[PDB]
Design an enzyme around this catalytic site. Structure first.
Site, PDB file in Angstrom:
ATOM      1  N   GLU A 138       2.499  -6.158  -8.325  1.00  0.00           N
ATOM      2  CA  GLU A 138       2.013  -4.943  -7.688  1.00  0.00           C
ATOM      3  C   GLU A 138       1.037  -5.388  -6.606  1.00  0.00           C
ATOM      4  O   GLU A 138       0.136  -6.182  -6.884  1.00  0.00           O
ATOM      5  CB  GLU A 138       1.282  -4.085  -8.719  1.00  0.00           C
ATOM      6  N   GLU A 143      -4.301   6.562  -3.607  1.00  0.00           N
ATOM      7  CA  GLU A 143      -4.471   6.381  -5.045  1.00  0.00           C
ATOM      8  C   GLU A 143      -5.837   6.956  -5.437  1.00  0.00           C
ATOM      9  O   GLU A 143      -6.786   6.861  -4.672  1.00  0.00           O
ATOM     10  CB  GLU A 143      -4.351   4.889  -5.444  1.00  0.00           C
TER      11      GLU A 143
END
Length: 189
Positions: free
Chosen positions: A85, A176
């Site tokens: 990620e 996010e």
């Protein structure tokens, strides 16, 4: 808001995920535009881009990003084999995501120095299920909410440092948030 999930909107891949706590709304707009509005949210991530991404994309983004609390604005994506990620963080709220992380170098790209870090997630959710995997970070020193990201400069610097990427999965410009509030409106191309 739209339903959490993935798909295509006006030619762009999108991903929107949340933990079900409430307090966040994500909207797809024309072209590569998306908006996020949140107030005392839980954990969430949303944005637009590509599926799959590439290792030499020049990603353009523009708009407004107004977090109140813990949030990031990043080029964000995954690789497979190895599972990674990754983040190229252009701005953030109250928390620098590299706090306490091992620094793996610096790279200059698109008008700023970035600091490079590697972290590890242990038995955490991923694109392939629960797993342990590394995260790679480039954190921009000069924060902004518009610009251009030459992803190859980051991926090449990471590779130089031993931070290898596998086959690219999705690659988006993402807002996010983790239990915070804010608003954002971003157009990707």
């Amino acid at each position: 808001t739209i339903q959490p999930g993935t798909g295509y909107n006006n030619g762009y891949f999108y991903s929107y995920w949340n933990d079900g706590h409430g307090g966040v709304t994500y909207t797809n707009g024309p072209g590569g535009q998306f908006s996020v509005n949140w107030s005392n949210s839980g954990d969430f991530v949303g944005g637009k881009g590509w599926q799959p991404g590439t290792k030499n994309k020049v990603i353009n983004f523009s708009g407004s990003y107004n977090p109140n609390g813990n949030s990031y604005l990043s080029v964000y994506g995954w690789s497979r084999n190895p599972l990674i990620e990754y983040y190229i963080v252009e701005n953030f709220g109250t928390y620098n995501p590299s706090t306490g992380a091992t620094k793996l170098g610096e790279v200059t790209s698109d008008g700023s120095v970035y600091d490079i870090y590697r972290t590890q997630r242990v038995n955490q959710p991923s694109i392939i299920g629960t797993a342990t995997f590394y995260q790679y970070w480039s954190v921009r020193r000069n924060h902004r909410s518009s610009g251009s990201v030459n992803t190859a400069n980051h991926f090449n610097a990471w590779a130089q440092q031993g931070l290898t990427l596998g086959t690219m999965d999705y690659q988006i410009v993402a807002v996010e948030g983790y239990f915070s509030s804010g608003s954002a409106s971003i157009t990707v191309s």
